[PDB]
Design a protein around this nucleic acid. Structure first.
Ligand SMILES: [K+]
Ligand SMILES: [K+]
Ligand SMILES: [K+]
Ligand SMILES: [K+]
Ligand SMILES: [K+]
Ligand SMILES: [K+]
Ligand SMILES: [K+]
Ligand SMILES: [K+]
Ligand SMILES: [K+]
Ligand SMILES: [K+]
Ligand SMILES: [K+]
Ligand SMILES: [K+]
Ligand SMILES: [K+]
Ligand SMILES: [K+]
Ligand SMILES: [K+]
Ligand SMILES: [K+]
Ligand SMILES: [K+]
Ligand SMILES: [K+]
Ligand SMILES: [K+]
Ligand SMILES: [K+]
Ligand SMILES: [K+]
Ligand SMILES: [K+]
Ligand SMILES: [K+]
Ligand SMILES: [K+]
Ligand SMILES: [K+]
Ligand SMILES: [K+]
Ligand SMILES: [K+]
Ligand SMILES: [K+]
Ligand SMILES: [K+]
Ligand SMILES: [K+]
Ligand SMILES: [K+]
Ligand SMILES: [K+]
Ligand SMILES: [K+]
Ligand SMILES: [K+]
Ligand SMILES: [K+]
Ligand SMILES: [K+]
Ligand SMILES: [K+]
Ligand SMILES: [Mg+2]
Ligand SMILES: [Mg+2]
Ligand SMILES: [Mg+2]
Ligand SMILES: [Mg+2]
Ligand SMILES: [Mg+2]
Ligand SMILES: [Mg+2]
Ligand SMILES: [Mg+2]
Ligand SMILES: [Mg+2]
Ligand SMILES: [Mg+2]
Ligand SMILES: [Mg+2]
Ligand SMILES: [Mg+2]
Ligand SMILES: [Mg+2]
Ligand SMILES: [Mg+2]
Ligand SMILES: [Mg+2]
Ligand SMILES: [Mg+2]
Ligand SMILES: [Mg+2]
Ligand SMILES: [Mg+2]
Ligand SMILES: [Mg+2]
Ligand SMILES: [Mg+2]
Ligand SMILES: [Mg+2]
Ligand SMILES: [Mg+2]
Ligand SMILES: [Mg+2]
Ligand SMILES: [Mg+2]
Ligand SMILES: [Mg+2]
Ligand SMILES: [Mg+2]
Ligand SMILES: [Mg+2]
Ligand SMILES: [Mg+2]
Ligand SMILES: [Mg+2]
Lengths: 65, 141, 383
RNA sequence: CCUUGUUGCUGUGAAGGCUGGCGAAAGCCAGCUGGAGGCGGCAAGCCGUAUUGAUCUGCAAAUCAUUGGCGUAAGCAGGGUA
RNA sequence: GAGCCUCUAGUGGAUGUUUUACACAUGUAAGGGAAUUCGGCAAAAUGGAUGCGUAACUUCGGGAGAAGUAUUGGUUCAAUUG
RNA sequence: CCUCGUCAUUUAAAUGGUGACGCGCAUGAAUGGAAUGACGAGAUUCCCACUGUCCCUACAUGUAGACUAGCGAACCCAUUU
RNA sequence: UAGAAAGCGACGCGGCUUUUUGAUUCUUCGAUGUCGGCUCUUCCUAGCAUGGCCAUGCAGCCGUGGCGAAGUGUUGGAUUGUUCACCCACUAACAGGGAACGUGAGCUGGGUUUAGACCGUCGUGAGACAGGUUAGUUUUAUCCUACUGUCCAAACAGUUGAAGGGAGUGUGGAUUAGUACGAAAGGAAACCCACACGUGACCUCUGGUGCAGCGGGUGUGCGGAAGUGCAACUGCCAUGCUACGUCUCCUCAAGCAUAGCUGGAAGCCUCUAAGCUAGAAAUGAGUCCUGACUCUGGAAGACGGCCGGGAAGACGACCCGUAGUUAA
């Protein structure tokens, strides 16, 4: 069982962990931890954070769609 | 129970979430009635203990005064329902939520809404105990 | 003069004086009422605290008066504690007699062969002994002293209890070579039946499945975590004083009036906190199982043991039988606890409901645990 | 009262001066030069507002920390004399 | 001749123990933001230089750094103080 | 003095602040009277920003403190408490 | 609305209290720190809410007068140095008091009440004024006793229970039900579920903290790079600790006020004179914490130090290990 997939990191989230953040734009979004939520606020682009699943796919280190 | 000025006739069950909003808190108004900002002066249902400030969560009814809005409406006392909150909440299923900004919506003594449209997202649990809010909210979460 | 505003007291006087417990192992001091109408059964056991995890269960509990038509079912997430319970071994019995001064012990009788683990409790320092402990007692079997002893117990007794020890050698993480010994009461039938039931079982092993089953309510007795000497702010919960005060803010300001000219026992003072005996009533058994047989739910079709990835932090892996119970339990990992059948049955609706599990969490307790098995980790990373 | 010692860095830009424009005149407007003041921010120093802070069998029969006021001058100081 | 870091030249002892509570010098804090208290006391916030833009009143000197806003590192070039 | 004077404004709420009024216990003209500018570590009220002052406390650092070696006092004292 | 007495009760008369202010001067002038607030504990009842009842000008809803009862509650703010007062908001309700006008080697220092200075009124003046205004140093426990924990009196293993402590309180929703009751308008009465305050524990989750660990930049040192000192800044974060997180809290017996049964005195009557039944958040026990004197057992060796650890800790004490799934 999973809670979902983290918006910023790309990481799958275990049941009973993480949090949803809801913006006034009306969108609901899931984050793995406080670490990656804060990186969003500070406008760090995910592709530069080299341990993320997003970054690894973009570089072609991991096979993706 | 109905005592004093501005009594409430339409009591409902509380949920046990954390209480982010307390006396002194200024918060936005979400409806189209013409008020813009509300200043919290009291909470319904609170019996109190020494040195503690009264506090509320989503679904609770607050007493407030209108500090921004149209001229006919300012410096008057009014009742409102809390629809979203910036402090974190935990559902009994274990899911946790947090909104970007807190807000409330104005009601009559009988629990009827003052306006006709509500800006932005609203918490699911509120729509379970205040059914009229479901009709005119932006999105439900 | 009377004080200006009303307020409640700080802390409960039901637990004063709050002194330190004498030793870490508790005796069950009170047992539920006997009833001659039922078969002979045991009333308690010993267990070791492993650690905590969480589970998801299905529920359907609602007000009987709620007018909703649909049979609503809902997921609930709950925290649970795991206890390890290897089989205890029976090694003797005691009879008691009722007097104007309460219960008094008549005689104690021991098995012919006793284990090294139990003899080790009788000496103080383990590695320095001549081991001439029980070596002359076996003659009493030849002499008929045992047969005279049983006669006296059977003739003159009101209450009968067995002596049992735990097999510490099965739990290596304890670093312990002396067994723990507990006296456990027998309820049901008559004195004669109780004595015969006991005699049949000296030297043998009783599994936990004799005493408890799933969904049962039980009482847990233990000693809490220790916290050393502490001030009034933490020991009794009193408020901190004004920010600009000289001579310290974390204290009670006034400790009495002029008369009486002494300090009362009801005023808060600094001292020991923690390491006290406490009993938790009516906790419910969610599951019973074994540390090395995998299990599954109707919904989670993975097959896994109770052990999380990397084990529990300062314990490792469960190997024997285990019980799982709702909520938190006294003391740190590795402490001994006493389990008892509930003293009286509960009327509360939250206690008497069924339990149906759909998921149990097995992720790592060190750091953020993000996989449920080694197979998932090997699949997420390469190769 | 007599004889001596002690002004480093910066801001603002008075009087006086030179060009260009406007005006019938009187004299108005720009840009630059010049460097006045018991005039501003600071340094070395001199002082003593707050914390009713520390200390109160003190380091000390009046001290210490942070925070403050003035610092191109009815400013601070040694010796001789009344 | 500020604070911070180095060269020349000069420098130091009541012993061991990881050491509860309460202190005295300091750090950080979800949501709320003076509700605290005689009283925002203490703390936080603002901060240099460059440009844009600056009110009432006034003894016409001032107010004025009014207020309010934007910019600032490394590298490689043009141009010569912009 | 009566007095927390009356009316307006500031707050949800004003023994406070500012604006008006005046038979002023007992205002008033170098015993100096009245209206402003620039300047006060002077007294007082409000707003914006900001915050452990507070709700309601939690965790961590240095130095003392506990225990130990060497050195080694005083206030006070009818005392049986 | 009839009517002394549901509720009131003129004109008069008898008491109790010490929480107001007087009256008096017995104790202290080789010194008992003086108003208010903050903090914290206990007691009283003349009962505001919450539980059981009786009367009614008690239809129902809301009330009013009385009885046994002190277990649990009685709040957040604006002006003011205030106790007091007066308003706003919440509430089941926002009762009244005592303990050297409780509480300064517990704090604070706004008021009053030393020495500076202004104003008004009084005085020829020096000066006065329970008139107004502003600035004005809060010392010392290391003694005895109390109180809170700690060891010994009490070899080791298993227990017993004398006596002392004590704990859960309240609100709402749904259902009965738009029912009974009332001309109508209005409008009640268990069980179950949600919550708040209080109590005791716990870290699986989520916040917080950053001592161990990994990274980044500014000024200046070790010829460069690499490894790095000092001034200190900054992003993440194990274990642990913590609340803004999670779990927790009823059952008997004897009986108060009352309302009843049988029943004489007193052929009738009658709750009482003997005897019996129902009876409160109150009382006494159990479940919960502390643990006096005891009781049962093994064996010619036992136990303490020294050495090494922690789940325990101020120091002692407690839990453990020493030729082994021992340590490095
Ligand atoms: K962080
Ligand atoms: K008092
Ligand atoms: K007991
Ligand atoms: K100049
Ligand atoms: K001082
Ligand atoms: K010294
Ligand atoms: K130099
Ligand atoms: K320099
Ligand atoms: K204030
Ligand atoms: K005040
Ligand atoms: K102060
Ligand atoms: K002019
Ligand atoms: K100005
Ligand atoms: K007034
Ligand atoms: K006013
Ligand atoms: K006059
Ligand atoms: K005059
Ligand atoms: K004159
Ligand atoms: K001044
Ligand atoms: K420390
Ligand atoms: K020391
Ligand atoms: K005197
Ligand atoms: K005083
Ligand atoms: K009553
Ligand atoms: K009471
Ligand atoms: K004092
Ligand atoms: K003692
Ligand atoms: K012996
Ligand atoms: K008792
Ligand atoms: K945790
Ligand atoms: K943590
Ligand atoms: K150096
Ligand atoms: K964390
Ligand atoms: K009875
Ligand atoms: K008792
Ligand atoms: K012997
Ligand atoms: K040791
Ligand atoms: Mg208070
Ligand atoms: Mg501590
Ligand atoms: Mg002080
Ligand atoms: Mg963990
Ligand atoms: Mg010069
Ligand atoms: Mg000057
Ligand atoms: Mg200097
Ligand atoms: Mg001077
Ligand atoms: Mg002062
Ligand atoms: Mg904060
Ligand atoms: Mg914040
Ligand atoms: Mg206050
Ligand atoms: Mg200040
Ligand atoms: Mg004021
Ligand atoms: Mg005026
Ligand atoms: Mg005059
Ligand atoms: Mg008196
Ligand atoms: Mg004295
Ligand atoms: Mg005397
Ligand atoms: Mg005294
Ligand atoms: Mg009474
Ligand atoms: Mg007093
Ligand atoms: Mg005192
Ligand atoms: Mg004063
Ligand atoms: Mg004076
Ligand atoms: Mg002064
Ligand atoms: Mg570190
Ligand atoms: Mg090993």
């Amino acid at each position: 069982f999973y809670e979902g997939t983290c918006v910023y990191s790309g990481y799958p989230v275990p049941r009973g962990k993480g949090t949803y953040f809801v913006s006034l734009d009306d969108k609901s979004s899931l984050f793995f931890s406080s670490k990656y939520k804060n990186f969003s606020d500070k406008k760090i682009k995910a592709k530069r954070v080299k341990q993320t699943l997003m970054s690894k796919q973009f570089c072609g280190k991991v096979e993706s769609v | 129970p109905g005592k004093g000025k501005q009594p409430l006739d339409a009591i409902k069950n509380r949920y046990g979430f954390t209480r982010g909003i307390q006396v002194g808190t200024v918060l936005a108004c979400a409806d189209n009635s013409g008020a813009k900002m509300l200043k919290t002066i009291g909470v319904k249902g609170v019996s109190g203990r020494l040195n503690r400030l009264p506090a509320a969560g989503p679904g609770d009814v607050i007493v407030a005064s209108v500090v921004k809005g149209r001229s006919d409406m300012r410096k008057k006392i009014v009742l409102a329902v809390i629809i979203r909150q910036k402090q974190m909440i935990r559902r009994k299923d274990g899911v946790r939520l947090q909104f970007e900004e807190s807000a409330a919506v104005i009601i009559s003594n009988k629990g009827d809404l003052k306006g006709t449209q509500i800006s932005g997202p609203v918490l699911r649990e509120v729509c379970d105990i205040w059914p009229k809010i479901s009709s005119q909210a932006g999105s439900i979460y | 003069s009377c004080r200006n505003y009303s307020a409640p007291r700080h802390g409960s006087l039901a637990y004063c004086p709050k002194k330190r417990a004498k030793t870490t192992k508790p005796a069950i001091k009170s047992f539920p009422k006997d009833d001659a109408s039922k078969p002979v059964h045991l009333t308690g056991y010993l267990a070791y605290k492993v650690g905590m995890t969480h589970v998801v269960r299905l529920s359907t509990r609602r007000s009987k008066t709620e007018r909703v038509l649909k049979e609503t079912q809902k997921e609930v997430l709950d925290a649970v504690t795991i206890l390890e319970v290897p089989a205890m071994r029976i090694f003797g019995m005691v009879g008691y007699k009722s007097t104007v001064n309460g219960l008094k012990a008549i005689k104690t009788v021991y098995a012919e062969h006793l284990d090294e683990q139990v003899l080790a409790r009788l000496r103080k320092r383990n590695s320095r002994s001549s081991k001439l402990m029980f070596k002359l007692y076996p003659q009493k079997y030849e002499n008929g002293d045992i047969k005279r002893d049983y006669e006296l117990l059977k003739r003159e007794s009101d209450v009968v209890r067995v002596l049992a020890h735990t097999q510490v050698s099965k739990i290596p993480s304890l670093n312990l070579k002396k067994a723990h010994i507990l006296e456990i009461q027998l309820n049901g039938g008559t004195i004669e039946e109780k004595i015969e039931w006991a005699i049949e079982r000296l030297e043998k092993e009783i599994p936990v499945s004799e005493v408890f089953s799933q969904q049962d309510l039980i009482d847990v007795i233990g000693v809490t975590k220790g916290k050393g000497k502490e001030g009034t702010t933490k020991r009794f919960g009193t408020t901190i004083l004004q920010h600009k005060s000289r001579k310290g803010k974390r204290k009670v300001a006034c400790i009495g009036a002029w008369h009486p000219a002494n300090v009362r026992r009801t005023v808060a003072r600094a001292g020991q906190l923690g390491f006290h005996r406490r009993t938790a009533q009516n906790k419910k058994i969610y599951m019973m199982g074994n540390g090395k047989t995998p299990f599954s739910t109707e919904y989670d079709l993975t097959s896994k043991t109770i052990n999380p990835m990397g084990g529990f932090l300062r314990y490792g892996n469960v190997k024997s039988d285990f019980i799982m119970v709702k909520g938190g339990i006294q003391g740190p990992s590795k402490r001994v606890l006493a389990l008892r059948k509930a003293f009286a049955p509960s009327n509360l609706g939250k206690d008497n409901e069924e339990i149906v599990l759909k998921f149990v969490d097995a992720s790592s307790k060190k750091g953020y645990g993000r996989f449920q098995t080694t197979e998932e980790k090997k699949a997420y990373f390469g190769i």
